Design a binder for this molecule. Structure first.
Ligand SMILES: [Cl-]
Length: 212
């Protein structure tokens, strides 16, 4: 079922069960929300999904609550690289008060040479239909191995991700690989309207677009 956006519980970050999951925890990015919503949980373990927000208020109205912080990831390989996609869901996406869209799904892909070496080769950040790419990864966008990402709307455009020198915040991570089947099914099948889950059955298609 669709449930109220502020009624989806945060999925606590689990102890990683394996190297794959530990590696995605390691590389959790920082997010600097310059404007718009904080990231919120989009799904619960039962497969309920966030109904999001009608964009009728100011940019951050009713989506200000930092206790609801959540980030998602999904890991894979692509063209010999090891990729971890990190994704945030925001309840709405407003370039100005009272306008914009219900729901927002954004994602960065951290590209590593391989999982064992884990050297960052490149970063991609979702911006509308495409990806901004940092290749070779610009070290000014890295706090050690932590990618520093901005979330921001610049008029006339909706919210998008970018790379930033600015410190950001981190969120409890739940990985696709750690979710319940119910949550995975729901994320696959739910219509998020203007927004799209980037780590569902479209995951390889996204990585292709993200590829540097
Ligand atoms: Cl609507």
């Amino acid at each position: 079922a669709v449930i109220n956006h502020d009624a989806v519980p945060v999925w606590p970050q689990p102890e990683p069960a394996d190297a794959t999951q530990a590696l995605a925890v390691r590389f959790k990015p920082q997010l600097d929300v310059v404007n718009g919503c904080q990231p919120y949980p989009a799904v619960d373990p039962q497969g309920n999904t966030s109904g999001g927000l009608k964009p009728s208020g100011s940019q951050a109205a009713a989506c200000r609550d930092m206790s609801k912080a959540q980030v998602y990831s999904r890991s894979g390989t692509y063209n010999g690289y090891y990729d971890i996609m990190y994704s945030w869901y925001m309840p709405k996406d407003s370039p100005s008060i009272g306008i914009g869209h219900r729901h927002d799904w954004e994602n960065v892909v951290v590209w590593l040479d391989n999982a064992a070496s884990a050297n960052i080769v490149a970063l991609s950040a979702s911006a509308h239909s495409g990806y901004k790419k940092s290749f070779p990864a610009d070290k000014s966008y890295l706090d050690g191995i932590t990618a520093k990402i901005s979330y921001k709307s610049t008029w006339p455009l909706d919210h998008e991700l970018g790379f930033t020198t600015s410190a950001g915040k981190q969120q409890p991570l739940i990985q696709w690989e750690q979710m319940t089947q119910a949550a995975r099914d729901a994320l696959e099948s739910t219509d998020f309207g203007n927004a799209n889950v980037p780590f569902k059955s479209n995951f390889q298609d996204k990585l292709v677009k993200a590829f540097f």
